[PDB]
Amino acid sequence: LRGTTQKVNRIREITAMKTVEALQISAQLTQLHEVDMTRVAELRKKNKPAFIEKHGVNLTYLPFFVKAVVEALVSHPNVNASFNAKTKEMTYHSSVNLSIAVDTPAGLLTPVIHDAQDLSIPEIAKAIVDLADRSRNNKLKPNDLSGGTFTITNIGSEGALSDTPILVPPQAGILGTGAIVKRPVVITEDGIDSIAIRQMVFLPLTYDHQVVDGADAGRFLTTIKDRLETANFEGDLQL
Template identity: 45%
Template sequence: MALEFKMPKLGESVTEGTIGRWLKQPGEELEQYEPMLEVTTDKVDTEVSAPINGTLLEILVPEGETVAVGTVIARLADSDEVASTGASNGATPAASAAPAQGGPANKAPISPAVARLAAEHAIDLRQVPGTGAGGRISKKDIEAFVAARKAGQASSAQPAAATTSPDATPDSTLATAATREVEAELHQALQSGPEALAQADAAAAMKQPQPASGDTFSTAQPKAPAAATLGPDDELVPLSPMRRAIADHMVRSKRTAPHVTTVMEADLSRVVAHRERHKGDFERQGVKLTFTPYFVQAVVAGLQAVPIVNASFGDDGIVMHQRLNIGVAVAIPDGLIVPVIKDADEKSLLGLARAVNDLAERARSRRLQADDTQGGTFTITNHGVSGSLFAMPIINQPQSAILGVGAMQKRVVVVSENGLDALAIRPMCYLSLTFDHRLIDGATADSFLGQVKRTLEQFQ
């Protein structure tokens, strides 16, 4: 007798998860609530705990494989059972005992219609979430997958930004917010082996149907446009799911949107003074006041003044987002992630600071929920944290613009007061705005960036 352990649902809109790492191996003892495996959903990594005291009998889904929520991924034995073999304690008997190392994750039957569509569209069925009985992939599931992939190729890609530093502090750098579909494609690239690792564009390759292989589940593999050539002294480092996601998002965003970057300079004297005055108060309330909340507030003012920047381009028209959900890129050891502050316009500086603290902390400790990274309408990347003066970030699709914040430096500037010019030393920083020229023109972008700059310079 064994317990079936299923892929848990890790967020409201989450329908599948990727096995990041098995922290326990078959035969190892489990302690209840002790981390058993890591699961990646979109960009969020989460540890999943053992539900019981007992033993991990068998791993049914290998690392790196994506399966639908509810799919059985392992078999466990209760410690009572281990002690007295065969004793029944009401546990669900495992339906299938077949190990699946590298094999198909979804054990539900594949209907003829699904098999045919998978072959026609060159789809790896392991990537398709099943909504049918017992997690079966239905014809509708595969049609939705194909439609999403097409939509993704047409108008959406993923994130963005310029420089990153692995040691950067919480609110720094770059952007990402994978769609499930994109990750599925990336995932497939990994499945297809080293030759696919070098491919710059998994999506384009997906359009080339390949002859079906013997395995029903991978009826076709993407064609790699270029193979990674491995010299005798070279070492091939496998791509982590996040690395692959970032790589694809960058390429897709660049291909999707004509990027234009405009740069302004802001005098942060008032912000610095404000922060000096208030950081003690904030600290007494348990909140660390960084510069990020000021930039979020300035961006909110800019978006309210120039709403087109808070929009998405689509072939049918421009989608004007009513909510101001500001993503803040956070560097983490092997990549970056963009948690989103929802309804940033409804939060005070204290509320923003608290949200930034919370999201950055959870991003670094990998405790973000999948929903935390979704729904962003604009992104800020604080590349200045790692010393960069200015950069040209890549847009976090399907958003229309991204603000790069450069390093704050004291510079000698000319200030004019009452008709008199004087030299002064001011804390200055460059603000670079990369925008999608399909829906935003230069003057509009400058009007937005000007509002951001004025809000910072006139901060009360």
């Protein structure tokens, strides 16, 4: 590539145009919360063999993030929404159509899990495997890329703690899952503080201030954080 000028492909041309425009037709800002993933990590380590044996797919952290985010989009319908700046009307989507960022040799794509609110953790794990595979092997259909109401992007896959991901209207939010890192943190029990090692992650949420304010974003991220930290997912694994 070095020392050359080359025309970009259609996917990269559209990405360049849409991201420049997206920032000018929305009011983006990125709120950041930290989440203790230790209990999810222990649950995943304990149940991974039985999960793979019963459902036929590997159990990663992604279905836990997806389950929590989709439940929070149902509980906070104001975030699963779109604003029309010409009519000043807000549309609150009944479907949670979750876009996921996927890496392909031709560029990043955002295929969609339609009606993700009806899916269990085993169904989510299978849908991720299917979308990632077809995205990398050029087997996506136009329906796989349209209708998204919210996006999740795994920025931690290449080592980042956090980012300010660009949302694409008509969506109102895009959540990044940063790298999960062991850190010394403070634990409080019966008013006594102590230092312990925990698996911590940053969850940066880019949100559109036309649709969501700082308090709305914080309540939505708190629902996600508390669901993941409690890690009451054994029943959800359907073992």
